[PDB]
């Protein structure tokens, strides 16, 4: 089918440029238009910009100065550049396909302009947070069974948790982290019944494997 | 800028509710509104585009309508599945510039367990210890976490996460007690007393009697 894979750094530092790449699998870039939409933590969806098929560009006027969007048909990828970032630009960034059309509107006998844009398909959203590797601890209960896999002290968000290389999809509940006073997150991923949980952290590029037994 | 929405709305289960989205004669007045559903943990899905047309896989229970400068999304037969943040949107001044709504928070009114973990043996080797109390599937999402040590209440190092929407329209949370291995053996018993609509579900672990 049609999906949009967002790829880029999940951490940037102030007064530098954040770059992202959207990989398009399932459709052509000379067939559909691509748009960028971000949501700030506690805010509304904010329009960023769009590039159609014909290579023309259009952005949110407030952020046109700091924005730039290009694409490469051959790689079937679209790029985004947000310059001179500040601590508020940390947000979830969604890659999307948009359908744009300027409808004309003349009187009822026969100029005018009525503009249309909407999002067709949404990406999944990677949260750029504007480095700390996690420490993994196995968990088991005191004397069905319940097994744990505690990820300890990591920055920035997020971490992706699986069990046995994606082969265990059952009874798993990954939890929302806590914001400790130290500013280091800590989340857990319970499983309820040779159990290795695989934890990855995109910022530190770390991948560890910790087995859990009672 | 942004479109006006009630930010917070409430309706009852199986009934009918309506979310207003009002703007100018340059955005909503042109009248090509879109609607979107954002459930936490999932991607935003497109609901209605061009005022009234429903998108792929969108049942006709979600009906888009418009009256001049105020578009209105109406959800018929509410379900727990429908609790989310709904955003409207229309283009302004160009085909390449969109504005979104503030987004309202849909609440379905009529709808009606915690495992406790000790710190890993590996963690106590750095003389650090972390009590993990994971609560899940309670509704609604208002829980009072109180740690208990030998009948007394603990205040230091209490770290609790806010309630979070799960896939099953249920709210789950996590609470962390970051201690050291020294005073972890000091008390004789530790209790994680969570309260949910007056009921107290308690999980307890004792340091010696757990190894």
Numbering used by the authors:
A (entry chain A): 27 to 136, 174 to 193, 198 to 210, 217 to 266, 274 to 294
B (entry chain B): 2 to 113, 119 to 217
Authors' own words:
Under these genetic constraints, cattle have developed a unique mechanism to accomplish antibody diversity by forming the broadest distribution of CDRH3 lengths and the most frequent occurrence of cysteine residues in CDRH3 loops. Consistent with the five structures solved previously, the 7 new CDRH3 structures also showed a long “stalk” formed by 2 anti-parallel β-strands supporting a compact, globular “knob”, further establishing the stalk-knob configuration as the general structural peculiarity for the ultralong bovine CDRH3s. Each of the knob structures starts with the conserved sequence motif [CP(D/E/A)G(Y/W)], in which the initial cysteine residue forms the first disulfide bond with another cysteine residue in the knob, and the motif forms a type I β turn. The compact globular folds of the knobs are maintained primarily by several disulfide bonds, a feature that is similar to the core of other small disulfide rich proteins or domains such as voltage-gated sodium channel antagonist mu-conopeptide, CnIIIC.
The four antibodies with 6 cysteines (BOV-1, BOV-2, BOV-3, BOV-4) used three different cysteine pairing patterns; BOV-1 and BOV-2 used, while BOV-3 used and BOV-4 used pairing patterns. The knob of antibody BOV-1 has 2 additional anti-parallel β-strands, extending from the second and the third of the three antiparallel segments. In contrast, in the knobs of antibodies BOV-4 and BOV-3, a two-turn α-helix and a long loop extend from the first and the second of the three antiparallel segments. These four knobs could be described as two-layered structures with the three antiparallel segments as the first layer, and the additional structural elements packed against the first layer as the second layer. In the crystal structures of antibodies BOV-6 and BOV-1, there are 4 and 8 copies of Fab molecules in one asymmetric unit, respectively. However, electron density associated with 4 or 3 knob regions of antibodies BOV-1 or BOV-6 is mostly or totally absent, suggesting that these ultralong CDRH3s are highly flexible. To examine the extent of this flexibility, we superimposed the heavy chain variable domains of each Fab molecule in the asymmetric unit for antibodies BOV-1 or BOV-4 in one asymmetric unit. The stalk orientations of stalks of Fab copies within an asymmetric unit for antibodies BOV-1 or BOV-4 significantly differ from the rest of heavy chain variable domains, which superimpose on one another. The twisting angles between the two strands of stalks are also different among copies of the Fabs within one asymmetric unit, suggesting that the CDRH3 stalks could undergo tilting and twisting motions due to their inherent flexibility. The superimposition of knobs on these Fabs within an individual asymmetric unit indicates that there are only small structural variations in knobs, suggesting that the knobs are structurally stable.
